[PDB]
């Protein structure tokens, strides 16, 4: 009789079933080639870097609708499926070529299920009417979209090197104490051949990383620069908080009623009591080191030190310019000329007119030390090195993330602007890259517009011509 009871118990314990939660950071996803063929085009002209010419721009303040932004095609012009969302975009440009990437998710945008990640390169060309557009020529996809995070790209010698963090614990920024610290680099040809696996899409392992005293380092920013055969990617280092040597007496809590001297130190972590503190810097990859080059982390100097954040280093009008996103208490746009690349020293511009939106904790135009972690990446590209005039898309609100506006400005003055969307349109990240098309300055701005109303949520690509006459 007991043997019958045994059978019934075994059935109920093993026959009845549920399934384990699925883990896709281990499971592969394979989608159809996103671009089996390059878009047909009759050998038209491209664009050059914005270097070496004293271009004419309007540099006077005006209330005229001088800027007339055009909306151009999406880098990878395919039909999105209802229910998907494209997030965490990258757009980099150098010498007429671009690198672009995005993560495509199902369900929610910020916390949905990834199905694929697109990383690819292409050409920036005259589309035919003296308006630049992005033509994709070479698209690579990782076999696992849930392991590739925070990619950055540098163009060098007909290849576009993309440095990504590899993580099986999710976003390395948030789960930093469990992150393996592994990095990978992808080398895509910008002029692909009919064959050759090692030419069109070559993957490199980064076996040797020189972190100095940092526990972990990673790429953190859309793009970098090259100097000869050396690539410099925007990056953040993770230092154990207790190893952070900082004097609270140097926290600018003057002209403040609600400040504490500790705020400048605590605010450099994601959380006031986080394990790691984030430091902005660069990752140097020298292509002539040998068969297996090393990655070297270069910390940013402490002038106006703040939290490591998405950053960008770009070559404009003859010199590298560094941009650091304002993700902490200092909300003023933080960017300027790079005086030294190694060590990284930046002559930050004393800009008082451009500032990011935030929460009521660290609202737009806040310059008083506070403990917060919040902000958006809204960069500015230098278009005039004599008057230090830069341009980019900024959100134009105090406690919200909305109303993207293309703005051309000086340190202490906004010269002119145009809206890219209605007053109440939501927007997040923007990436601005300026170049010369037929010797005229054009800026392509990728803007993450979240127009919930309909269709499929995607970044929009705006092509804005910088005006010569203020009329």
């Amino acid at each position, epitope marked *: 009789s007991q043997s019958t009871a045994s059978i019934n118990e075994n059935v109920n314990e093993k026959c009845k079933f549920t399934l384990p939660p699925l883990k896709i950071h281990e499971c592969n996803i394979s989608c159809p080639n996103p671009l089996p063929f390059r878009e047909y085009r009759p050998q038209t002209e491209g664009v050059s870097n914005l270097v070496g010419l004293p271009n004419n721009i309007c540099l006077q303040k005006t209330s005229n609708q001088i800027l007339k932004p055009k909306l151009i095609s999406y880098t990878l012009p395919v039909v999105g499926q209802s229910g998907t969302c494209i997030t965490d975009p990258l757009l980099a440009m150098d010498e007429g070529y671009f690198a672009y990437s995005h993560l495509e998710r199902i369900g929610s945008c910020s916390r949905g299920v990834s199905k694929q990640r697109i990383i690819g390169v292409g050409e920036v060309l005259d589309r035919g009417d003296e308006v630049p557009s992005l033509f994709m020529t070479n698209v690579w996809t990782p076999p696992n979209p849930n392991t590739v995070y925070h990619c950055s790209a540098v163009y060098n010698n007909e290849f576009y090197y993309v440095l990504c963090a590899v993580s099986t614990v999710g976003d390395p920024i948030l789960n930093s104490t469990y992150w393996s610290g592994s990095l990978m680099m992808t080398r895509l040809a910008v002029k692909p051949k009919s064959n050759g696996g090692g030419y069109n899409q070559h993957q490199l392992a980064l076996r040797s990383i020189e972190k100095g005293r940092y526990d972990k380092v990673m790429p953190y920013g859309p793009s970098g620069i090259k100097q000869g055969d050396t690539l410099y990617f925007p990056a953040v280092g993770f230092l154990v908080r207790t190893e952070f040597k900082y004097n609270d007496s140097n926290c600018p809590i003057t002209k403040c009623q609600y400040s504490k001297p500790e705020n400048c130190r605590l605010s450099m972590g994601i959380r006031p009591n986080s394990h790691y503190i984030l430091r902005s810097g660069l990752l140097k990859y020298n292509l002539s080191d040998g068969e297996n080059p090393k990655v070297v982390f270069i910390e940013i100097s402490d002038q106006r030190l703040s939290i490591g954040s998405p950053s960008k280093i770009y070559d404009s009008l003859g010199q590298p310019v560094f941009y650091q996103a304002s993700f902490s208490w200092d909300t003023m746009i933080k960017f300027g000329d790079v005086l030294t690349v190694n060590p990284l020293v930046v002559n930050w511009r004393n800009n008082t007119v451009i500032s990011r939106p935030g929460q009521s904790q660290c609202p737009r135009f806040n310059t008083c030390p506070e403990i917060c972690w919040e902000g958006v990446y809204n960069d500015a590209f230098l278009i005039d090195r*004599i008057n230090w005039i830069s341009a980019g898309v900024f959100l134009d609100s105090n406690q919200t993330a909305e109303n993207p506006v293309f703005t051309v400005f000086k340190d202490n003055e906004i010269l002119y602007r145009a809206q890219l969307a209605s007053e109440d349109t939501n927007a997040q990240k923007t990436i601005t890259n300026c170049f010369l098309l037929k010797n005229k300055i054009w800026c392509i701005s990728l803007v993450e517009i979240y127009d919930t109303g309909d269709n499929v949520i995607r970044p929009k690509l705006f092509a804005v011509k910088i005006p010569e006459q203020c009329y």
Partner: antibody
Amino acid sequence: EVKLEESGGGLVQPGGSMKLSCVASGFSFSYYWMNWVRQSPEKGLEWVAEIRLKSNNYGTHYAESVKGRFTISRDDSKSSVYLQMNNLRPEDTGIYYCTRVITTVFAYWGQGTLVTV
Amino acid sequence: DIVLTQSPASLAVSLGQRATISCRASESVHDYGISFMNWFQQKPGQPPKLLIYSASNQGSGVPARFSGSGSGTDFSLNIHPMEEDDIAMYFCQQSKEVPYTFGGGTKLEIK
């Protein structure tokens, strides 16, 4: 704050030589072209010599009137520009200015150093 | 070599009046859609200050009082209204070719 400071001026007899030196600060010297321009009430301003970047293989250009007598060089680790003037002539009397060129424009000038021959 | 002629040799303008200085080039300084024509203001005892560049770009630290225009071989500097601090030698520069050249300068004074 961009500062260019010339030195090495003074009175040198004809047939002699002088070396001027411009010390630069406040900017990324290694990424900019540097030029010398000289001023004399008789001629106004005239260009003397240009020195390009290391990436341009330190290419140089000289005004026809000084070519073969003057040499222009750089020492980036000291943020400086030098002008070596050999076989000086009375014609070289004037104020020598160190300039920084941004996108082909002589945006910054030093105070200038007097050279008399 | 491109040579420049400036005219008139000197100006006398009452305060509040317009002062115009012209340049003519022996050869076009236009290239890349840009006119490579610069202007410098030199006050006594001081180095030349960039006043205007690329024909019309106002320059850094330059008031609305100064503007310029032109293309090809015909350029001008327009100062209006003139102030008492605009007494200077104004030099016209060609920057398209090597050698770089300057005009003889136009000295602007007041009456």
